[PDB]
Amino acid sequence: MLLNLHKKSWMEGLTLQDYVVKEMLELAKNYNKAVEEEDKMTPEQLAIKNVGKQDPKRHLEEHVDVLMTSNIVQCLAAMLDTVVFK
Amino acid sequence: AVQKVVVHPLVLLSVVDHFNRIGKVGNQKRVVGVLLGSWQKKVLDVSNSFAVPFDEDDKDDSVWFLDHDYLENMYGMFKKVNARERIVGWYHTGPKLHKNDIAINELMKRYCPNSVLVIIDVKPKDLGLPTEAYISVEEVHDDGTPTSKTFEHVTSEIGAEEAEEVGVEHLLRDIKDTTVGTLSQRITNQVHGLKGLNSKLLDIRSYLEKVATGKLPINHQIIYQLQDVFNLLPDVSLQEFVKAFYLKTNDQMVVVYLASLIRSVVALHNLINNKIANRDAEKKEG
Amino acid sequence: ILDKKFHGILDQGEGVLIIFDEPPVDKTYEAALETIQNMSKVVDSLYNKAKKLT
Amino acid sequence: LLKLFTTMELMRWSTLVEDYGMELRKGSLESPATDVFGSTEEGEKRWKDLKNRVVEHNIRIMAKYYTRITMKRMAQLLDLSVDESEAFLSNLVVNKTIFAKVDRLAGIINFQRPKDPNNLLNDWSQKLNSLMSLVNKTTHLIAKEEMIHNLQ
């Protein structure tokens, strides 16, 4: 019951009250441009030569999962009209 | 007065432990107790509660017993160890209300004017929400009786506090916060859709039962008056959003163009890293 | 309207001459500018890819 | 005068001209009627300021109450003329504080939002506002279920 009242209270939304859908996508396309060009500028400077040098500085660019989960949220929350309505 | 609260599950285990006190020895089978409340703001707050030794009989259903040393000087010992905590209300089980409720309301109002009691459940396998909160005002009626202290409902909610899940969430281990996109919202979907339209099936069913044999909600005309607030959308026989035809077209527009563009760029993320990393670490044969 | 602009398109039969555009759309622009160089990288890597095999 | 102060009562201006041209006749008291109305000077500009106020008030309340409207029906429902609305609305656009819209080829004119640039609040209004009231309908219709199940 505290598991229930932790992912029912201590995580927001009492589940009647979640289904931010759009202004979060305005801010998220700000994200999906600003994160994107930095995802662009870096891997130009990957090991485009034939060097056998072995010393990396680690930054792990990738930025995939933000896009992925945020846009699954965007598509299934754009679903909300056809879902909750009819 | 009382509008919304902040309630922490220490009161909940303080219900369940007195349930352990009177369950195996079960003779009157009920947990009725007193809700101490750190009344800070218009929003209420609780960090303590105690269960009174108590009975409640069925015949004339107004025989009931506090323990006023356990009510007064235990509260005084509590006030000595914590003066911030004071009384705000009480709690009980047996979610079916009854006639003695208004009597313990009469006595709970003299301790705190805007008091609030708590209907609980000992096993919530609910939708769900936790336990209940009221507000006792006097609206008397359209009837003309002496004063009607009918229980009006406060919308109940739950707050939080630092360092109060330390071992419990450690024991459950099934905590999964960041997964919204597959499950955490479809649970809400199932929940609000099915569980709201079946409460609405109780609405049509109960109120058509009032049509057949029942109150037939006259003189609380806020029932159908608020079904009009539902009836913002009538949806007559063509379902009537053919004015939202182009609006829904323009709504599908934005997110689906986001889908097309952004997910093509998501492919451009995935594929290049996957192919380069795999071709490197694969052709390195040793 | 010809030489200079304030982006007033010729709105002959309305009565406002509505002056409108959305200049920030440049997420799409920026992604195009990405693709142009992303596959310059890929094509530069293809030399290694089709070279170190055979 | 208080009746003029909240939608001003959609009326004929000359009826109020009756009701306030009696005030120069009214009583021994005539000097406020002189200062406002009985002046062949600034008080005549106060007459025309009342003209300004009545057409401006038609703008003030009807610029809320506009979806689509013809030109000349407006022009005659402004307690004034049709072609005179050229100057009598050029002043209301050098007023420049109401974004507006008119068409002279078909007469259909309109004072409104800048042509639906953001479609969101339709969805937000319906879903969040009304349907969160509807998910509150669960929370307070079980409360009213408890209300009726006091006596049930």
Curated annotation (Swiss-Prot), chain A:
An annotated GO BP: double-strand break repair via nonhomologous end joining
Sorted UniProt keywords: DNA damage, DNA repair, Hydrolase, Metal-binding, Metalloprotease, Phosphoprotein, Protease, Proteasome, Ubl conjugation pathway, Zinc
Gene Ontology CC: cytosol; cytosolic proteasome complex; extracellular region; ficolin-1-rich granule lumen; nucleoplasm; nucleus; proteasome accessory complex; proteasome complex
Residue positions where Phosphoserine is found in the record: 9
Modification Phosphothreonine occurs at: 42
GO function terms (MF aspect): endopeptidase activator activity; K63-linked deubiquitinase activity; metal ion binding; metal-dependent deubiquitinase activity; metallopeptidase activity; proteasome binding
Tissues expressed in: Widely expressed. Highest levels in heart and skeletal muscle.
Chain segments annotated as transmembrane: none
Quaternary data: Component of the 19S proteasome regulatory particle complex. The 26S proteasome consists of a 20S core particle (CP) and two 19S regulatory subunits (RP). The regulatory particle is made of a lid composed of 9 subunits including PSMD4, a base containing 6 ATPases and few additional components. Within the complex, PSMD4 interacts with subunit PSMD7 through their respective MPN domain. Interacts with TXNL1.
Entry similarity comment: Belongs to the peptidase M67A family. PSMD14 subfamily.
Name the UniProt record assigns to this protein: 26S proteasome non-ATPase regulatory subunit 14
Biological source species: Homo sapiens (Human)
Upper classification of the organism: Eukaryota, Metazoa, Chordata, Craniata, Vertebrata
Gene assigned in the entry: PSMD14
From Swiss-Prot, chain B:
Entry annotated with the keyword Ubl conjugation: yes
Gene Ontology cellular-component annotations: cytosol; extracellular exosome; extracellular region; ficolin-1-rich granule lumen; membrane; nucleoplasm; nucleus; proteasome complex
Alphabetical list of InterPro entries matching this protein: EIF3F/CSN6-like_C, JAMM/MPN+_dom, MPN, MPN_RPN7_8
Entries under SMART domains matching the protein: JAB_MPN
Pfam families attached to this UniProt entry: JAB, MitMem_reg
Entry-annotated residues carrying N6-acetyllysine: 200, 210
An MF annotation (GO) of this entry: protein homodimerization activity
Covalent link Glycyl lysine isopeptide (Lys-Gly) (interchain with G-Cter in ubiquitin), residues: 176
Start and end residues of each MPN domain: 5-140
Keyword Transmembrane helix included in the entry's annotation: no
Keywords: Acetylation, Isopeptide bond, Proteasome, Ubl conjugation
GO BP: any one term: proteasome-mediated ubiquitin-dependent protein catabolic process
Assembly and interaction partners: Component of the 19S proteasome regulatory particle complex. The 26S proteasome consists of a 20S core particle (CP) and two 19S regulatory subunits (RP). The regulatory particle is made of a lid composed of 9 subunits including PSMD7, a base containing 6 ATPases and few additional components. Within the complex, PSMD7 interacts with subunit PSMD4 through their respective MPN domain. Interacts with TRIM5.
Alphabetized PANTHER family for the sequence: 26S PROTEASOME NON-ATPASE REGULATORY SUBUNIT 7, EUKARYOTIC TRANSLATION INITIATION FACTOR 3 SUBUNIT F-RELATED
Similarity section: Belongs to the peptidase M67A family.
Note: Does not bind a metal ion.
Protein name listed in UniProt: 26S proteasome non-ATPase regulatory subunit 7
Biological source species: Homo sapiens
Swiss-Prot record, chain C:
Subcellular location: Nucleus; Cytoplasm, Cytosol
Post-translational modifications reported in the UniProt record: Phosphorylated by AMPK.
Signals that turn on the gene: By FOXO4; expression in embryonic stem cells (ESCs) is mediated by FOXO4.
Tissue: Highly expressed in embryonic stem cells (ESCs). Expression decreases as ESCs differentiate.
Oligomer and partners: Component of the 19S proteasome regulatory particle complex. The 26S proteasome consists of a 20S core particle (CP) and two 19S regulatory subunits (RP). The regulatory particle is made of a lid composed of 9 subunits including PSMD11, a base containing 6 ATPases and few additional components.
Free-text function comment from the UniProt entry: Component of the 26S proteasome, a multiprotein complex involved in the ATP-dependent degradation of ubiquitinated proteins. This complex plays a key role in the maintenance of protein homeostasis by removing misfolded or damaged proteins, which could impair cellular functions, and by removing proteins whose functions are no longer required. Therefore, the proteasome participates in numerous cellular processes, including cell cycle progression, apoptosis, or DNA damage repair. In the complex, PSMD11 is required for proteasome assembly.
Similarity comment: family membership: Belongs to the proteasome subunit S9 family.
Name of the protein in question: 26S proteasome non-ATPase regulatory subunit 11
Gene name per UniProt: PSMD11
Shown residues within the full chain: 369 to 422 of 422
From Swiss-Prot, chain D:
Domain PCI: residue ranges: 1-116
Transmembrane segments: none
Modified positions (N6-acetyllysine) in chain numbering: 64
Disease (UniProt): Stankiewicz-Isidor syndrome: A neurodevelopmental disorder characterized by delayed psychomotor development, intellectual disability, behavioral disorders, mild dysmorphism, ophthalmologic anomalies, feeding difficulties, deafness, and variable congenital malformations of the cardiac and/or urogenital systems.
Function: Component of the 26S proteasome, a multiprotein complex involved in the ATP-dependent degradation of ubiquitinated proteins. This complex plays a key role in the maintenance of protein homeostasis by removing misfolded or damaged proteins, which could impair cellular functions, and by removing proteins whose functions are no longer required. Therefore, the proteasome participates in numerous cellular processes, including cell cycle progression, apoptosis, or DNA damage repair.
Family per record: Belongs to the proteasome subunit p55 family.
Complexes and interactors: Component of the 19S proteasome regulatory particle complex. The 26S proteasome consists of a 20S core particle (CP) and two 19S regulatory subunits (RP). The regulatory particle is made of a lid composed of 9 subunits including PSMD12, a base containing 6 ATPases and few additional components. Interacts with ERCC6.
Full protein name: 26S proteasome non-ATPase regulatory subunit 12
The species this protein was found in: Homo sapiens
